[PDB]
Amino acid sequence: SGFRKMAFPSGKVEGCMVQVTCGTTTLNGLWLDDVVYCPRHVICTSEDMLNPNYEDLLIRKSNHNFLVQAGNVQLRVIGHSMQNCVLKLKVDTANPKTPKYKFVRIQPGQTFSVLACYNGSPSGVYQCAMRPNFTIKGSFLNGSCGSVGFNIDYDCVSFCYMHHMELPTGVHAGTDLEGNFYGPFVDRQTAQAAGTDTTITVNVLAWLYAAVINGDRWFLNRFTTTLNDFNLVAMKYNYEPLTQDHVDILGPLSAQTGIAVLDMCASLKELLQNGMNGRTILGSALLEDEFTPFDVVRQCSGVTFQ
Amino acid sequence: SGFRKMAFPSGKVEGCMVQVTCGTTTLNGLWLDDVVYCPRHVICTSEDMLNPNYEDLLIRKSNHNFLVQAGNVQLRVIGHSMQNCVLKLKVDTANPKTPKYKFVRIQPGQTFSVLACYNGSPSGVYQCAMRPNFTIKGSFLNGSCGSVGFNIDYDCVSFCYMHHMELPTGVHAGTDLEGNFYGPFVDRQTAQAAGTDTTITVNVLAWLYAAVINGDRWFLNRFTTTLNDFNLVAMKYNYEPLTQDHVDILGPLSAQTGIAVLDMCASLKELLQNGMNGRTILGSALLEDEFTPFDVVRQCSGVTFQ
Ligand SMILES: *[C@](O)(C(N)=O)[C@H](C[C@@H]1CCNC1=O)NC(=O)[C@@H]1[C@@H]2[C@H](CN1C(=O)[C@@H](NC(=O)CC(C)(C)C)C(C)(C)C)C2(C)C
Ligand SMILES: *[C@](O)(C(N)=O)[C@H](C[C@@H]1CCNC1=O)NC(=O)[C@@H]1[C@@H]2[C@H](CN1C(=O)[C@@H](NC(=O)CC(C)(C)C)C(C)(C)C)C2(C)C
């Protein structure tokens, strides 16, 4: 029993992190097979960050201007290209620690583990959600760019995030491993603002199921609701609309607990309208939305990775 | 910027986890050099758990009754002994993945990373504190026994926890790697109760400093206090008494922020007496006590591990 924000074991990703230096700028890269992936703003000076023309800046860069270091050892860069907002550095050595992996562009509401790195060295690991406004609430300092987010499915690492930047209110923006930003963000030091940070309703419901499974049941009430009536309350509280697909996805947790999804929505409705009256659920005084239904099943059934 | 519950990268510990089976019971062991460490209740049946005589049960066990599996491969057990509440299985192969390591018995209020394992396979990683009542608030299911807690200091893994059992209210008890339980717990299925769960005051103060560093400053008030006057308020709210040693330990965060520890205590006093009025600090609606001063400095300065 117990329920914690749990990251995937990071060992398979630790063996892929390297340091990339171009001129004065050092950040992290991802070494898979004979390619290093890194944020393209590695080629920028601080001045350049204000209004960069990446194609123009890249003309002044050759293979030998990229220093790539795997622990204490330099890799030889034999080619480079820009794909959207990432550079791909072809190196003459395949990473012998390359795991089975895929590149995935995740949907908003999905979770992943971040391995925060500095100078190609892992600092720490934590769980994040892709928020509805396509930001993440990370912990990133200067030097953390190129840190990656991932999920593990038994043996296979699905890389879904590379860290590029921080927005006002200290939330974070980045790309998939094809270099396409999540949301409307650009890799320029220019005024950009996150939209409304809406709550991931289906994840809050998943977490309420986790609470029940752990014997935290005080919030289970005597009411039910409809999707349409529940969604009139969600709209007011900046909750994502709940759909039938969401109800389907909560099927395993609903079946395990014997609590109909719409009965759990009616419990959520009362928590939104009345607050928690100074009570806690799984040690939290707020409604948690960074656990997916899969995260709850995985933690409550003990799914492992090899 | 941003502040998250952050685990150490787990790769160095993943390469030490094995599966130990004795009769019908399977749990996790820790393979360092030519020794496997595991909970001694691996030798018990369910019946035995009610009132076990471990010395007597062990007489019926030989080297060949312990099956130890590192991934897909069996290790040969050439010796066994019981040290307090752990078994030490001598195997004929030194783990080639053994990191630099130490065994440390941590103090209450200290934090560590848990790598939750099932059948010798890592499931996930998360941060925990040793609570004042010598419990941890983990996520552990049947099969998780032998999972370990650790800290990393650059290259060196300090193992401080091995998981043995769950108490009522779904908190967890275990041993150091010499097999001595933290607190008064025994490895018997008998009525045992946790004492009062007191709050780690110095850690709450460390987290308030983390909030300031991140620009969350609304709670900074106009008052100061004394250690003795602050401690009269802590006693009422089941906070640990703050000592001069604690004030010394908060020195780096106090110096970085320019906020005197006793001024931060006066802010904490007002939060304890008035509550948060529905406001949040680093996205929390409660006072967090599972970050040490070191955890805050480490996260806010980007300390890495190799
Ligand atoms: C990254 O390059 C690195 N070396 O780690 C760096 C990571 C930042 C630093 C603080 N927290 C982080 O996550 N990323 C950057 O410095 C990117 C880079 C240029 C600026 N930038 C930023 O993240 C800016 N933010 C903005 O410009 C957006 C704004 C103005 C709306 C806040 C800040 C000011 C450094 C945070 C580019 C190419 C985007
Ligand atoms: C461990 O052996 C394993 N195979 O993973 C197991 C882990 C538990 C299961 C549920 N959550 C966990 O952390 N540990 C045990 O089963 C230990 C073991 C015998 C009983 N036990 C327990 O943890 C008991 N708890 C108690 O007996 C204490 C009590 C009665 C005060 C609650 C429970 C009932 C299974 C949780 C021994 C030797 C302690």
CSV table of all heavy atoms in Angstrom, one decimal, chain A residues 25-27 41 49 54 140-145 163-168 172 186-193, chain B residues 1, ligand 1:
chain,number,residue,atom,x,y,z
A,25,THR,N,29.0,27.6,-25.2
A,25,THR,CA,27.7,27.1,-24.7
A,25,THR,C,27.9,25.6,-24.5
A,25,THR,O,28.4,24.9,-25.4
A,25,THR,CB,26.6,27.4,-25.7
A,25,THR,OG1,26.6,28.8,-26.0
A,25,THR,CG2,25.2,27.0,-25.2
A,26,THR,N,27.6,25.1,-23.3
A,26,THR,CA,27.6,23.6,-23.0
A,26,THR,C,26.2,23.2,-22.5
A,26,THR,O,25.6,23.9,-21.7
A,26,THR,CB,28.6,23.2,-22.0
A,26,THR,OG1,29.9,23.3,-22.6
A,26,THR,CG2,28.5,21.8,-21.5
A,27,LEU,N,25.6,22.2,-23.1
A,27,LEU,CA,24.4,21.6,-22.6
A,27,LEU,C,24.4,20.0,-22.9
A,27,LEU,O,25.5,19.5,-23.1
A,27,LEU,CB,23.2,22.3,-23.3
A,27,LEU,CG,23.3,22.5,-24.8
A,27,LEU,CD1,23.5,21.3,-25.6
A,27,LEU,CD2,22.1,23.3,-25.2
A,41,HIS,N,19.9,25.5,-30.1
A,41,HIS,CA,20.4,26.7,-29.5
A,41,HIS,C,21.8,26.5,-28.8
A,41,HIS,O,22.4,27.5,-28.4
A,41,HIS,CB,19.5,27.5,-28.6
A,41,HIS,CG,19.1,26.9,-27.3
A,41,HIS,ND1,18.0,26.2,-27.1
A,41,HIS,CD2,19.8,26.9,-26.1
A,41,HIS,CE1,18.0,25.8,-25.8
A,41,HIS,NE2,19.1,26.2,-25.2
A,49,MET,N,20.5,34.6,-28.8
A,49,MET,CA,19.2,34.1,-28.2
A,49,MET,C,18.0,35.1,-28.4
A,49,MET,O,16.9,34.6,-28.4
A,49,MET,CB,19.3,33.9,-26.7
A,49,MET,CG,20.6,33.1,-26.3
A,49,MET,SD,20.5,31.3,-26.3
A,49,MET,CE,21.2,30.9,-24.7
A,54,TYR,N,18.8,30.5,-37.2
A,54,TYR,CA,19.6,29.3,-36.9
A,54,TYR,C,20.3,28.8,-38.1
A,54,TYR,O,21.4,28.3,-38.0
A,54,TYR,CB,18.6,28.3,-36.3
A,54,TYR,CG,18.3,28.5,-34.8
A,54,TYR,CD1,17.1,29.1,-34.4
A,54,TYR,CD2,19.3,28.2,-33.9
A,54,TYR,CE1,16.9,29.4,-33.1
A,54,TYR,CE2,19.0,28.5,-32.5
A,54,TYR,CZ,17.8,29.0,-32.1
A,54,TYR,OH,17.6,29.3,-30.8
A,140,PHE,N,14.5,22.8,-13.5
A,140,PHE,CA,15.5,23.0,-14.5
A,140,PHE,C,16.3,24.3,-14.2
A,140,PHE,O,15.7,25.3,-14.1
A,140,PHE,CB,14.9,23.0,-15.9
A,140,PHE,CG,14.2,21.8,-16.4
A,140,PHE,CD1,12.9,21.7,-16.6
A,140,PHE,CD2,15.0,20.7,-16.8
A,140,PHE,CE1,12.3,20.5,-17.0
A,140,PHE,CE2,14.4,19.5,-17.3
A,140,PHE,CZ,13.0,19.5,-17.4
A,141,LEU,N,17.6,24.2,-14.1
A,141,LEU,CA,18.5,25.3,-14.0
A,141,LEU,C,19.3,25.5,-15.3
A,141,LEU,O,19.2,24.6,-16.1
A,141,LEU,CB,19.5,25.1,-12.8
A,141,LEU,CG,18.8,24.8,-11.5
A,141,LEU,CD1,19.9,24.3,-10.5
A,141,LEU,CD2,18.1,26.0,-10.9
A,142,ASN,N,20.0,26.6,-15.4
A,142,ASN,CA,21.0,26.8,-16.5
A,142,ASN,C,21.9,25.6,-16.6
A,142,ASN,O,22.4,25.1,-15.6
A,142,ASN,CB,21.7,28.1,-16.3
A,142,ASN,CG,22.4,28.5,-17.6
A,142,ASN,OD1,21.7,28.8,-18.6
A,142,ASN,ND2,23.7,28.5,-17.6
A,143,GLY,N,22.1,25.0,-17.8
A,143,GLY,CA,22.8,23.8,-18.1
A,143,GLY,C,22.0,22.6,-18.3
A,143,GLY,O,22.5,21.5,-18.7
A,144,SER,N,20.7,22.6,-17.9
A,144,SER,CA,19.8,21.4,-18.0
A,144,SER,C,19.2,21.2,-19.4
A,144,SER,O,18.7,20.1,-19.6
A,144,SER,CB,18.7,21.6,-17.0
A,144,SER,OG,17.8,22.7,-17.3
A,145,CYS,N,19.3,22.1,-20.3
A,145,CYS,CA,18.8,22.0,-21.7
A,145,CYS,C,19.4,20.7,-22.2
A,145,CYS,O,20.6,20.3,-22.0
A,145,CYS,CB,19.2,23.2,-22.5
A,145,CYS,SG,18.2,24.6,-22.0
A,163,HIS,N,14.4,19.0,-23.1
A,163,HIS,CA,14.2,20.4,-22.5
A,163,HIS,C,14.9,21.5,-23.3
A,163,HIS,O,16.1,21.3,-23.6
A,163,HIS,CB,14.7,20.3,-21.0
A,163,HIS,CG,14.4,21.6,-20.3
A,163,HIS,ND1,13.1,22.1,-20.3
A,163,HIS,CD2,15.2,22.5,-19.8
A,163,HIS,CE1,13.2,23.3,-19.7
A,163,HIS,NE2,14.5,23.6,-19.4
A,164,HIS,N,14.2,22.6,-23.5
A,164,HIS,CA,14.8,23.8,-24.2
A,164,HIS,C,14.7,25.1,-23.4
A,164,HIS,O,15.6,25.9,-23.5
A,164,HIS,CB,14.1,24.1,-25.6
A,164,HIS,CG,14.5,23.0,-26.6
A,164,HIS,ND1,15.1,23.3,-27.8
A,164,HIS,CD2,14.1,21.7,-26.6
A,164,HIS,CE1,15.2,22.1,-28.5
A,164,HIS,NE2,14.6,21.2,-27.8
A,165,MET,N,13.6,25.3,-22.6
A,165,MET,CA,13.5,26.7,-22.1
A,165,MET,C,12.5,26.8,-20.9
A,165,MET,O,11.7,25.9,-20.7
A,165,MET,CB,12.9,27.6,-23.3
A,165,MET,CG,11.5,27.3,-23.7
A,165,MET,SD,11.2,28.2,-25.3
A,165,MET,CE,10.9,29.9,-24.7
A,166,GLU,N,12.6,27.9,-20.2
A,166,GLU,CA,11.7,28.2,-19.1
A,166,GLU,C,10.8,29.5,-19.4
A,166,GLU,O,11.4,30.4,-19.9
A,166,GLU,CB,12.5,28.4,-17.8
A,166,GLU,CG,11.7,28.7,-16.6
A,166,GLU,CD,12.6,28.8,-15.4
A,166,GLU,OE1,13.2,27.7,-15.0
A,166,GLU,OE2,12.7,29.9,-14.8
A,167,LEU,N,9.6,29.5,-19.0
A,167,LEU,CA,8.6,30.6,-19.2
A,167,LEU,C,8.3,31.3,-17.9
A,167,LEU,O,8.7,30.8,-16.8
A,167,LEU,CB,7.3,30.0,-19.8
A,167,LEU,CG,7.5,29.3,-21.2
A,167,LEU,CD1,6.3,28.3,-21.4
A,167,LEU,CD2,7.5,30.3,-22.3
A,168,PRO,N,7.6,32.4,-17.9
A,168,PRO,CA,7.4,33.2,-16.7
A,168,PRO,C,6.4,32.3,-15.9
A,168,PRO,O,5.6,31.6,-16.5
A,168,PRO,CB,6.8,34.5,-17.2
A,168,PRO,CG,6.9,34.5,-18.7
A,168,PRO,CD,7.1,33.1,-19.1
A,172,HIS,N,8.0,25.1,-18.0
A,172,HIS,CA,9.1,24.7,-18.9
A,172,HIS,C,8.5,24.2,-20.2
A,172,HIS,O,7.3,23.7,-20.2
A,172,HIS,CB,9.9,23.6,-18.2
A,172,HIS,CG,10.5,24.1,-17.0
A,172,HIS,ND1,10.2,23.7,-15.7
A,172,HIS,CD2,11.5,25.1,-16.8
A,172,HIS,CE1,10.9,24.4,-14.8
A,172,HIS,NE2,11.7,25.2,-15.5
A,186,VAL,N,8.6,28.9,-29.2
A,186,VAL,CA,9.7,29.0,-30.1
A,186,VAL,C,11.0,29.2,-29.3
A,186,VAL,O,10.9,29.7,-28.2
A,186,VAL,CB,9.5,30.1,-31.1
A,186,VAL,CG1,8.3,29.9,-32.0
A,186,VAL,CG2,9.4,31.5,-30.5
A,187,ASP,N,12.1,28.8,-29.8
A,187,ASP,CA,13.5,28.8,-29.2
A,187,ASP,C,14.1,30.2,-29.5
A,187,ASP,O,15.2,30.3,-30.2
A,187,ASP,CB,14.4,27.6,-29.5
A,187,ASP,CG,14.5,27.3,-31.0
A,187,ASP,OD1,13.8,27.9,-31.9
A,187,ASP,OD2,15.3,26.4,-31.3
A,188,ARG,N,13.5,31.2,-28.9
A,188,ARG,CA,13.9,32.6,-29.0
A,188,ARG,C,13.6,33.2,-27.6
A,188,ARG,O,12.5,32.9,-27.0
A,188,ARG,CB,13.2,33.3,-30.1
A,188,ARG,CG,13.6,34.7,-30.3
A,188,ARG,CD,12.8,35.4,-31.4
A,188,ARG,NE,13.0,36.8,-31.3
A,188,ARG,CZ,12.4,37.7,-32.1
A,188,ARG,NH1,11.5,37.4,-33.0
A,188,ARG,NH2,12.7,39.0,-31.9
A,189,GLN,N,14.4,34.1,-27.2
A,189,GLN,CA,14.3,34.9,-25.9
A,189,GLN,C,13.4,36.1,-26.2
A,189,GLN,O,13.9,37.2,-26.4
A,189,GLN,CB,15.6,35.2,-25.3
A,189,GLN,CG,15.5,35.8,-23.9
A,189,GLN,CD,16.8,35.9,-23.3
A,189,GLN,OE1,17.7,35.0,-23.5
A,189,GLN,NE2,17.1,37.0,-22.6
A,190,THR,N,12.1,35.8,-26.3
A,190,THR,CA,11.1,36.8,-26.7
A,190,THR,C,9.9,36.5,-25.8
A,190,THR,O,9.8,35.4,-25.3
A,190,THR,CB,10.8,36.7,-28.2
A,190,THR,OG1,10.1,37.9,-28.6
A,190,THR,CG2,9.9,35.5,-28.6
A,191,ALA,N,9.0,37.6,-25.6
A,191,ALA,CA,7.8,37.5,-24.8
A,191,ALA,C,7.0,36.3,-25.3
A,191,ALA,O,6.7,36.3,-26.5
A,191,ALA,CB,7.0,38.7,-24.9
A,192,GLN,N,6.8,35.3,-24.5
A,192,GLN,CA,5.9,34.2,-24.7
A,192,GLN,C,5.2,33.9,-23.4
A,192,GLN,O,5.8,34.0,-22.4
A,192,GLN,CB,6.6,32.9,-25.2
A,192,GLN,CG,7.4,33.2,-26.5
A,192,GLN,CD,8.2,32.0,-26.9
A,192,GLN,OE1,7.7,30.9,-27.3
A,192,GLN,NE2,9.5,32.1,-26.7
A,193,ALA,N,3.9,33.6,-23.5
A,193,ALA,CA,3.1,33.3,-22.3
A,193,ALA,C,2.3,32.0,-22.5
A,193,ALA,O,2.0,31.7,-23.7
A,193,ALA,CB,2.1,34.5,-22.1
B,1,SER,N,14.6,27.2,-12.7
B,1,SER,CA,13.7,27.4,-11.6
B,1,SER,C,12.7,26.2,-11.5
B,1,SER,O,12.8,25.3,-12.4
B,1,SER,CB,12.9,28.7,-11.7
B,1,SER,OG,11.6,28.6,-12.2
C,1,LIG,C1,19.1,25.9,-21.6
C,1,LIG,O1,19.7,26.6,-22.8
C,1,LIG,C2,20.3,25.5,-20.8
C,1,LIG,N1,21.7,25.8,-21.1
C,1,LIG,O2,20.1,24.8,-19.8
C,1,LIG,C3,18.2,26.9,-20.8
C,1,LIG,C4,17.5,26.4,-19.6
C,1,LIG,C5,16.7,27.4,-18.8
C,1,LIG,C6,17.6,28.3,-17.9
C,1,LIG,C7,16.7,28.6,-16.6
C,1,LIG,N2,15.8,27.4,-16.7
C,1,LIG,C8,15.7,26.8,-17.8
C,1,LIG,O3,15.0,25.8,-18.1
C,1,LIG,N3,17.3,27.5,-21.8
C,1,LIG,C9,17.4,28.8,-22.2
C,1,LIG,O4,18.2,29.6,-21.8
C,1,LIG,C10,16.4,29.2,-23.3
C,1,LIG,C11,17.1,29.5,-24.6
C,1,LIG,C12,17.0,31.0,-24.8
C,1,LIG,C13,16.4,31.7,-23.6
C,1,LIG,N4,15.9,30.5,-22.8
C,1,LIG,C14,15.1,30.6,-21.8
C,1,LIG,O5,14.7,29.6,-21.2
C,1,LIG,C15,14.7,32.0,-21.3
C,1,LIG,N5,13.2,32.1,-21.5
C,1,LIG,C16,12.7,32.9,-22.5
C,1,LIG,O6,13.4,33.5,-23.3
C,1,LIG,C17,11.2,32.9,-22.5
C,1,LIG,C18,10.5,34.1,-21.7
C,1,LIG,C19,11.2,35.4,-22.1
C,1,LIG,C20,9.0,34.1,-22.1
C,1,LIG,C21,10.6,33.8,-20.2
C,1,LIG,C22,15.1,32.3,-19.8
C,1,LIG,C23,14.8,33.8,-19.6
C,1,LIG,C24,16.6,32.0,-19.6
C,1,LIG,C25,14.3,31.5,-18.8
C,1,LIG,C26,16.3,30.1,-25.8
C,1,LIG,C27,16.9,29.8,-27.1
C,1,LIG,C28,14.8,30.0,-25.7
